[PDB]
Amino acid sequence: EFITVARPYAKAAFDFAVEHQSVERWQDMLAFAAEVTKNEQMAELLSGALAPETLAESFIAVAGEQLDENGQNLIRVMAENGRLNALPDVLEQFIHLRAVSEATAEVDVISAAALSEQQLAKISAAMEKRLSRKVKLNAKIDKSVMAGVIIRAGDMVIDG
Amino acid sequence: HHHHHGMATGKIVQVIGAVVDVEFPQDAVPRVYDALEVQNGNERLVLEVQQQLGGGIVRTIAMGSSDGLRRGLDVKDLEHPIEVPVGKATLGRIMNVLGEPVDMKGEIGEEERWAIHRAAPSYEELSNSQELLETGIKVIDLMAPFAKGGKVGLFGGAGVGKTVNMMELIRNIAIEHSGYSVFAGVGERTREGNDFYHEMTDSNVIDKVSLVYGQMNEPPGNRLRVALTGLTMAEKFRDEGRDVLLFVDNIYRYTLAGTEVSALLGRMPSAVGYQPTLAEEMGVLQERITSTKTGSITSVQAVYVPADDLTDPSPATTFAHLDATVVLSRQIASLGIYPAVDPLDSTSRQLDPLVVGQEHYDTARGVQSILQRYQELKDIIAILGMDELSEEDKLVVARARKIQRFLSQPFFVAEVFTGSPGKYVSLKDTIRGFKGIMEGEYDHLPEQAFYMVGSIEEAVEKAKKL
Amino acid sequence: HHHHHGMATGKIVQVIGAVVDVEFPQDAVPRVYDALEVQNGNERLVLEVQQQLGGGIVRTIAMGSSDGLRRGLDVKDLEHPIEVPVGKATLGRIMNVLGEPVDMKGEIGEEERWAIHRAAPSYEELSNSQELLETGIKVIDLMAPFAKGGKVGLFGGAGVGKTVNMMELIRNIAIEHSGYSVFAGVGERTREGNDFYHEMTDSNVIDKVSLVYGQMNEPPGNRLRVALTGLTMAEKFRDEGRDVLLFVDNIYRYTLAGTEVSALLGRMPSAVGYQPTLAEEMGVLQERITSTKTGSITSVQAVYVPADDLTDPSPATTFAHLDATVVLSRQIASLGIYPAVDPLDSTSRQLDPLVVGQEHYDTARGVQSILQRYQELKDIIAILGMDELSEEDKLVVARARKIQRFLSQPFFVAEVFTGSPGKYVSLKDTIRGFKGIMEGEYDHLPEQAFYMVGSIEEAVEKAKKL
Amino acid sequence: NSTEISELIKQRIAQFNVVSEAHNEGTIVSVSDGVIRIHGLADAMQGEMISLPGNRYAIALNLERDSVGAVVMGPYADLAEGMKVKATGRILEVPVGRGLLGRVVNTLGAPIDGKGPLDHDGFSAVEAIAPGVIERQSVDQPVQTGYKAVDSMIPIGRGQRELIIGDRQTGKTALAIDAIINQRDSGIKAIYVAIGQKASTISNVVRKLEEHGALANTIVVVATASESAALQYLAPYAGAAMGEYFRDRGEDALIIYDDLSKQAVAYRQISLLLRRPPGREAFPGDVFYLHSRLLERAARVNAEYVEAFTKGEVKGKTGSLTALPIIETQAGDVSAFVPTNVISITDGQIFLETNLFNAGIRPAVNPGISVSRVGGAAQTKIMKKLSGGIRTALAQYRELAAFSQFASDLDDATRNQLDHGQKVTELLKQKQYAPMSVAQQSLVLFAAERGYLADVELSKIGSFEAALLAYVDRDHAPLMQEINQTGGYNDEIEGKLKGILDSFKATQ
Amino acid sequence: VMGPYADLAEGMKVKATGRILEVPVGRGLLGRVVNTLGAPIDGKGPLDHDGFSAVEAIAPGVIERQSVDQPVQ
Ligand SMILES: Nc1ncnc2c1ncn2[C@@H]1O[C@H](COP(=O)(O)OP(=O)(O)OP(=O)(O)O)[C@@H](O)[C@H]1O
Secondary structure, X not given: OOOOOHHHHHHHHHHHHHHOOHHHHHHHHHHHHHHHHHOOHHHHOOOOOOOXXXXXXXXXXXXXXXXXXXXXXXXXXXXXXXHHXXXXXXXXXXXXXXXXXXXXXXXXXXXXXXXXXXXXXXXXXXXXXXXXXXXXXXXXXXXXXXHHHHHHHHHHHHHO | OOOEOEXXXXXXXXXXXXXXXXOOOOOOOOOOOOEEEEOEOOEOOOEEOOOOOOOOOOOOEOOOOOOOOOOOOOEEOOOOOOOEEEOHHHOOOEEOOOOOEOOOOOEOOOOEEEOOOOOOOOOOOOOOOOOEOOOOOOOOOOOOOOEOOXXXXXXXXXXXXXXXXXXXXXXXXXXXXXXXXXXXXXXXXXXXXXXXXXXXXXXXXXXXXXXXXXXXXXXXXXXXXXXXXXXXXHOOOOOOOOOOEEEEOOOHHHHHHHHHHHHHHOOOOOHHHOOOOHHHHHHHHHHHOOOOOOOOOEXXXXXXXXXXXXXXHHHHHHOOOOOEEOOOOHHHHHOXXXXXXXXXXXXXXXXXXXXXXXXXXXXXXXXXXXXXXXXXXXXXXXXXXXXXXXXXXXXXXXXXXXXXXXHOOOOHHHHHOOOOOXXXXXXXXXXXXXXXXXXXXXXXXXXXXXXXXXXXXXXXXXXXXX | XXXXXXXXXOOOOOOOOOOOOOOOOOOOOOOOOOEEEEOEOOEXXXXXXXOOOOOOOOOOEOOOOOOOOOOOOOEEOOOOOOOEEEOHHHOOOEEOOOOOEOOOOOEOOOOEEEOOOOOOOOOOOOOOOOOEOOOXXXXXXXXXXXXXXXXXXXXXXXXXXXXXXXXXXXXXXXXXXXXXXXXXXOOOOHHHHHHHHHHHHHOOHHHHOOEEOOOOOOOHHHHHOOHHHHHHHHOOOOOOOOOOEEEEOOOHHHHHHHHHHHHHHOOOOOHHHOOOOHHHHHHHHHHHOOOOOOOOOEEEEOOOOOOOOOOOHHHHHHOOOOXXXXXXXXXXXXXXXXXXXXXXXXXXXXXXXXXXXXXXXXXXXXHHHHHHHHHHHHOHHXXXXXXXXXXXXXHOHHHHHHHHHHHOOOOHXXXXXXXXXXXXXXXXXXXXXXXXXHHOXXXXXXXXXXXXXXXXXXXXXXXXXX | OOOOOOOHHHHHHXXXXXXXXXXXXXXXXXXXXXXXXXXXXXXXXXXXXXXOOOOOEEOOOOOOOOOEOOOOOOOOOOOOOOOOOOOOOOOOOEEOOOOOOOOOOOOOOHHHOOOOOOOOOOEEOOOOOOOOOOOOEOOOOOOXXXXXXXXXXXXXXXXXXXXXXXXXXXXXXXXXXXXXXXHHXXXXXXXXXXXXXXXXXXXXXXXXXXXXXXXXXXXXXXXXXXXXXXXXXXXXXXXXXXHHOOHHHOOEEEEEEEOOOHHHHHHHHHHHHOOOOOOHHHOOOHHHHHHHHHHOOOOEOOHHHHHHOOOOOOOOOOOEEEEEEEOOOOOOOOOOOHHHHHHHHOOEEOOOOOHHHHOOOOOOOOOOOOEOOOHHHHOOHHHHHHOOOHHHHHHHHHHHHHHOOOOOOOOOOOHHHHHHHHHHHHHHOOOOOOOOOHHHHHHHHHHHHHHHHHOOOOHHHHHHHHHHHHHHHHHHOOOHHHHHHOOOOOHHHHHHHHHHHHHHHOOO | OOOXXXXXXXXXXXXXXXOOOOEEEOHHHOOOOOOOOOOOOOOOOOOOOXXXXXXXXXXXOOOOOOXXXXXXX
16 A cells, blocks of 8 residues: 555656557556455465465466466565565556546536546536536535535625 | 474575574474574574474574574574483583584583473472582671571682682582582683683582583673583582582673673563573572482673673672672781681571571671671771780780681692692581680680681691691 | 756655655656755755655755745755855855855855865875964963964953954964964854954954854854865865964854754764764865965854863863863962963973973073973962062062063064064063063063063063163 | 666577676776776675776775776776776785895885885785784783883783873874883884874975984884875774784884874775775664774784794794884864774873973873883882882872962962972973983982982972982982893892982082 | 473464463462472372362452451561
């Protein structure tokens, strides 16, 4: 969960992986791995194991070894490191690898969520709300917005 | 010594330190004690596992140094630590601190590869009992009583004839006592140790005790090692019934030694980082030394002064490890008497009032009154003209001249040294001859008559010589 | 500047402290010294790497403060630390502690961006040699000898005319000595520093030494900075052959300064957390100051008293950094003489007995006998009616009145101050005129004749004036 | 740590399986100040001193598994890591044997001789330890202090060890070199190791190397403010070896060193830098483990030694190695752990009062508070025998002076003692740069022994007719060479001295 | 670690009595010699154990306490 060890990971992920294009390919392999630790017996059995060799062994082995050899010999790398203990850190950091690479997004304020990928501000944003259509903001629609301006307002009711 | 057939182990994982960061045959772990004997470069390496820790990865340590080797390795596991040729054959023959044939091959008699681990007996075993002791030192074994099979705190500065009196101990512990008389030392001056080989010829009786020495540059484990194998030895002598009585060198070396020990651990050590259990090691220690069933397990108690510590958890422990208190007089050495040391502060604990009852409550306790007698007779009566002082105070000064001269007595040591024969003394001739004589009887006995003269037949029949 | 073209670096990783938790252009690391000059908000930031540590992540520190910025950053790397315009042009012109044009632009003459790192010479380089020193102070350079190109411990309280005598040093180090006379200070009182600009007009000779000042609120690096650039300066003066002699302010500021230094490190610092190598920095220090080949690298040694420490590892080092011991007399200031300070405790080390041999072993050592002469003549003979005291003791009181008056002498300072001209003095007229005269010759020379009067032609020809 | 790579974890993707970089050179991993985590050099030899890039054989002691940490060889801070390794398994090879003597050394060695081309036998390790306990010579081998009070007070010989503290500003640094003048002729080659010295001290010192002489007798150590723990701290540990040239020739080997504590926090402050445990006073028993190691060494060694020590080449020469501590007197801080420790270690000892150097009495030191193991053990019939009654009598004139002030009227007991001991006490002081002759010692032997000085005993005539004594003595006493040659207490020559002493009354 | 701690390796199958402090109780056992580590001792280790008990004891009721002057000889 340090994710910094996994930072060096996701580093080597875009790096060797995307270099191998395993950023996607071991996005697949990686996916299967988080599936492996996701196995709770494989969690229940996660660490009793002194030999990390035993771990990568029963790991690729158990799970079905969808990891690359970059991830099998890397399975020696992190498994041996035992930093393999934390799967998702560099998984969301790899999601941050390809995704950060691809980043365009949005966040709905005073609205039900948006997340419309906007490479630029207001780019897909004003295009979305303008594009609304939706325009309802349903989650945060009214009480949230009207309590936003009226939030500032009660903030004036600070005068009491 | 043991298996370690098979070379066992494996690498030394992180090569740092004598303790093992080491791959053993990872399943392989012995008792932490149970040794692991590798090849150390050329040398055969060995470490009793310092740690018991799995994966064949545990601390296993030695008194040496590691630079130069590979982290890779394999280390045979000497299934036994502690088992080293041991028994009474060593006597006189030079053992290294390894017991190794220290001298030109000192060949301390190779004996049972014998576990160092010999230790405390049953309540009764080394006898549930009390065993008193004296060898009849001329003025001394008379002076203080003692308990057999043990050790008693020794405080005195210099000019002991400790080697002389040791020859009296040769003349006693070897001679006037039979029980196997062994001794050992560590941390000396090189050619002065060789000069204790000179002295070893002075007594010449060196044959009673194997020569095994530390030479303080010996590392902390090296420095602290020899004892329990010493119990593989009294595992002869006392166990051999020829009562183990072995002379004990160095506490400061041992006190500070256990300090350096628990320090090296990096552990929460004793206070001021000392060996936490060093005292418990004293429980194991006196636990070893008892007038035994087997043979009295006895030890000469003298301490490398742990800086002669104040209140000295050592002397605190060495008090009650002193059945008799001790002092040595440069002043009686200034008196120079054949009794040249400090009777002041030197006597058995319970001797006078009880436990001899009157026997020493009269002869010796009343004798202590006489210590007041020449104490303020010599001292007080010395303050000004003693004409005031009743001649009893001057016959406490013939307690001094006459009686204290009688204290000056030939020595079984001085026989073994100057020829002045000395004896295993009879305190009857003290409790009477010196008590009655020194007090009221034959007060005409000259100092000289008494001086350098043994029991009241030597002092008082030297008063026939006057 | 150096490079630091390119803005280099990157973020300041964890934004805490002037030392860098910082992403540099991670591959980029300079010499830890080798500077990194960023933009600090508006300001251009700079840090010589405090740590050399990889990933462009190393401590890199500055005398300022970080609040307000982002952990994100990029910091240009000034390939050189230490290189700052330096040379002898600065003389008189006000340098900041930055050397910056301290005054209205003090414009200490911009010179070689010059590495601070100027340091020790070869055995022969700055003088494998000994170089003695005196400027001929009226009663003083006569009084004590000195060694050229160096520094000597200064102990004295108050009323020095240290600025006056500095004008005598202007009248000497600038005048009666040519060798480039530079000086610097730090940690003063604000308008009292400005009043040392007033004094800078008093001597008016301020032009010999750039004005560079600390103003003690300067942070610890700020406080401790200026020296080695000072060696980029003597890298003119001494190196300029016009012997670098620069006056040295503050040890307590420096002693405590290095304390605050190694403290900030959090390192095992010197004892009581001081700068561990501050003394080694003294080896680099006197290593800098030598009567040189180049020009005598000399320094006025006076210490911000590191609390005037007792046994003072500073005075311990400042002893042996004192070729001459020092005292200043409020009593000779109570004597108020043109010689107003304490000759007691002030003389060169080896002057009298040898090294002048008799020259001072007679004139000066015998002169010290005369110090006993008015010492117990004035003192002892003062105890009661001196009628007992031979008039020699009263001609040791004409050593006092007459001779000690002769000590009172006009000053090249007092010229530069009160007009009382003073001189580079000739101790011949001491070693003879004042030694013979003060002792036996023209003992009729009045105090006044001698008082406030220079060498025995001024004192004794003022005895022609009487 | 490991994850740092991510590039060699990019490798390790394969290169946790892929592998096999073992070489004497893998990269310096982490460069700060001569401490670099470092790679390759798989198995490397003892502290293997790895000839560094543009830099000395770099030593890493106990193998740091992942990236061996390394030692500053000269410059600590130069650059970034990744050097591979400029590498040698060898540690501890320095020119050995008797070769290079007299021509000055660096901390490197003879090279810092202006010559610098002084060739010892050749590269040797620098360690040494005790001569054979058994194989040891006891060399009474007397020694001449040059300030007589010590010499007669304390004779000694090859093998010796003793403690010393030189007082602040006097007399430590200067100390005894008059003895060295006396020992310009010593003939047992002697050098001193001074820690972290200041140069010109060494320069004009060299003026006294000409003057007193003779630098050629032996070259000496070099250490200055920049001495690394290599230089500084190891220098005492460093100098241990080649004196076996002499010593393990069975020949007499002797050398000096003093005041190393820059070793103590060089190595100890190193331990902090090492992250290694600072012992008491931030330095461990590697004091007594060093004294254990280094300081256990000095002995005259047996014939049995050079039958081995010289390997039967000297076929039983007695390997003679004497050396002595000086921990310069400072601060009054004394036991000082290691110093106490080493106090325990000290065979002989010098308690040395400044106070008389503070009194400027040429004789500064603490009188018998300085206590040597050896002493008149080496002293001769004149020296041992004739010169005996010193220190206690000293305590007399001291103690005899003692009561005088408060309770007064000390008779000619103390007068005729304390003053007689104050007069002779005056005769004691021996100035800096004063060596002392054995015949010159005989002056006290007869004179004091004869009480003969009591004639001239006025320190005026004591010194004066002590000089007429010296002169017409040298006139009247040409045969004294024999005496000077002799160990004295020669009853014939004794009477001879009574007579030439009658001469010594007016003349000598 | 109860008693000797150094014998063997970790991973010995952990054997568990769920009882802290079941120790011979009750007034049966008086006089028969006992170790502190155990009721056994020379000569008779045995004594009349009114049964396994736990030691630790809080103060009795202050309120319910028999204030007792029971004399001292
Ligand atoms: N007892 C003494 N009386 C007079 N002068 C002395 C005495 N001892 C030493 N000196 C003088 O002092 C000098 C010795 O001082 P030295 O150079 O040794 O400083 P130091 O003693 O090393 O001081 P520190 O111990 O602080 O280093 C010699 O030149 C000597 O003339």
